[PDB]
Structure 1
Amino acid sequence: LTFESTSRFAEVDVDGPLKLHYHEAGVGNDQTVVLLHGGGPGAASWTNFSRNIAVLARHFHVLAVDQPGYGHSDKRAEHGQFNRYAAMALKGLFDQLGLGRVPLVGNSLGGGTAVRFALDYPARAGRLVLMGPGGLSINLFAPDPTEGVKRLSKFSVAPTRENLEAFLRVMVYDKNLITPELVDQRFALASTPESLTATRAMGKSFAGADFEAGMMWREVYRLRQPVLLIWGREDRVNPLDGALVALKTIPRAQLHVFGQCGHWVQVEKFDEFNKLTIEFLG
């Protein structure tokens, strides 16, 4: 497994052709799992889930999808509420690949996409594993915008190297993870005009009349499947108090909280996260 061997493209229909890039691994395993990455500038499937795709592929058929706006998937200048938009895309990939009811793994932005998908297409979503998820989270104590969200915005307005490192450092508990190479690589991807276009589209979509589609804490009481919520105690993007409504209202919820862990659970607690996910998904 390299970026190239696993790379795949599909074209789906979401008000018109939409190219989705994903990675496929562990082919031949009976049970398929879909991984949905976190947001943040420069984010994509391969780098987000580097500490995991290989391990998970020893147990599952893994499909790690670049959400629209990220990675090598299309970066339209236009789009509605994002989680719903990405969920519609994922629905097209599901139909195309002939996929049935599949468990979903989602980190941060992609966790929100996972939930939106599970709500909109309930027969198609199996068990959920959600790490510092957006969407279903609502920060009952932390004033919004959080520190993490503010630094992301500040990057979006002024896309400098300094603003990106500042953002990345409040993503993780262990700031030694934020190396010069990580910052440089992420900045190179995030700084392209296409990615800047996608950032503009993400910004305008917030003003949309479909905003309620992002407020999934209002809806997850309807989720019938087991759901494993995973949180870094020190998450400064989507803080721990945001887990509470979901834990309370999802009937078959579990919550796991890691001390000394930020927003990036699958990297910062990669060994522990992998065993939980593998056990939880069978």
Structure 2
Amino acid sequence: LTFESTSRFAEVDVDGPLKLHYHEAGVGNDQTVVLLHGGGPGAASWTNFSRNIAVLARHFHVLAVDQPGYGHSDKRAEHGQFNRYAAMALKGLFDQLGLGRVPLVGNALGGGTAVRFALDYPARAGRLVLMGPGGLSINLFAPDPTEGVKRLSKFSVAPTRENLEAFLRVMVYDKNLITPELVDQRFALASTPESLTATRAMGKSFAGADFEAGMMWREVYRLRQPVLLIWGREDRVNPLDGALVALKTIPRAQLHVFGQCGHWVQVEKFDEFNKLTIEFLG
């Protein structure tokens, strides 16, 4: 299991050709699971789910998809509401790979996409595992934009190493996790012209008239599958209070909260997260 051995590309149709990069592992396992990574301008499937893919691959057929604008998937200069955009791409991939109904694992931005997908193509989404998910969260107490959102916005405005480091440091409870080699690695990816284009496209999409598609806390009462919401108690991007509406309105919801854990649950509580997910997904 290396980046290269698991790398795959697909071309799907979303208002024309869109190249999607993904990682495939655990081929031969019966149950397929799709993983959808978090935000942050230099983020991608492989780095996001580094402490997870190999473990999950022992039990599942794992497809970890780079979301349009990220990793090695296409980075268009414009799109509509992002989650609906990425969900359209995912549907294309489902159809192309012949997937029927499949559980989705999504963090942050990727949680919003898993939810958008599960709402837009209800028959295609099985059980959901969502870690500090965007979109379905609404921060009832935390003033928006939150500190995590503001720090990401600052980088988008001024893409400096310093701004990326300040952003990364609010992703985690244990800030020692934010090493110089981590910062340098993400910055190199984050600061490419193509990443800058994606960041620009994202910012512009917020001002779209299809913004309601992002307010998924209004819709999740319609979800019929079990949904495991997982949060870091110390999430500074999508804070804990953002879990409440989804917890209340999703009939088969569960919530697990980890103390001493920031926004990156899959990293900071990787073992606990792994086992929770394996058990939940059968």
TM-score w.r.t. length of structure 1: 1.00
* 1:139 shift after superposition: 0.2
* 1:68 shift after superposition: 0.1
- 1:185 equivalent to 2:179? Answer no
* 1:193 shift after superposition: 0.2
Stretches of structure 1 lacking an aligned partner (at least 5 in a row):
none
Give the whole-Å Cα distance in 1 for the aligned partners of 2:72 and 2:177: 24
- 1:240 equivalent to 2:233? Answer no
Deviations 1:135-168 (A, max 9, x none): 0000000000000000000000000000000000
Tell me the C-alpha RMSD between the 2 structures: 0.3
* 1:41 shift after superposition: 1.8
What's the % identity of the aligned pairs?
Answer: 100
Give the whole-Å Cα distance in 1 for the aligned partners of 2:33 and 2:163: 34
Give the whole-Å Cα distance in 1 for the aligned partners of 2:254 and 2:64: 23
Give the whole-Å Cα distance in 1 for the aligned partners of 2:219 and 2:149: 23
Give the whole-Å Cα distance in 2 for the aligned partners of 1:116 and 1:96: 19
Give the whole-Å Cα distance in 1 for the aligned partners of 2:211 and 2:112: 13
Deviations 1:8-30 (A, max 9, x none): 00000000000000000000111
* 1:98 shift after superposition: 0.2
What is the count of residue pairs matched by the alignment? 282
Give the whole-Å Cα distance in 2 for the aligned partners of 1:74 and 1:182: 24
Secondary structure of 2:33's aligned partner:
strand
Deviations 1:29-73 (A, max 9, x none): 110000000001200000000000000000000000000000000
Deviations 1:51-107 (A, max 9, x none): 000000000000000000000000000100000000000000000000000000000
Give the whole-Å Cα distance in 1 for the aligned partners of 2:242 and 2:207: 23
Deviations 1:236-272 (A, max 9, x none): 0000000000000000000000000010000000000
Give the whole-Å Cα distance in 2 for the aligned partners of 1:152 and 1:240: 19
Deviations 1:208-237 (A, max 9, x none): 000000000000000000000000000000
Give the whole-Å Cα distance in 1 for the aligned partners of 2:100 and 2:59: 18
Give the whole-Å Cα distance in 1 for the aligned partners of 2:57 and 2:207: 39
Give the whole-Å Cα distance in 2 for the aligned partners of 1:249 and 1:115: 14
Secondary structure of 1:142's aligned partner:
coil
Equivalent residue number for residue 91 of structure 2: 91
Equivalent residue number for residue 18 of structure 1: 18
Give the whole-Å Cα distance in 2 for the aligned partners of 1:119 and 1:277: 21
Give the whole-Å Cα distance in 1 for the aligned partners of 2:218 and 2:201: 25
Give the whole-Å Cα distance in 2 for the aligned partners of 1:190 and 1:199: 9
Give the whole-Å Cα distance in 2 for the aligned partners of 1:18 and 1:53: 24
Give the whole-Å Cα distance in 1 for the aligned partners of 2:206 and 2:149: 13
TM-score w.r.t. length of structure 2: 1.00
Give the whole-Å Cα distance in 2 for the aligned partners of 1:240 and 1:101: 29
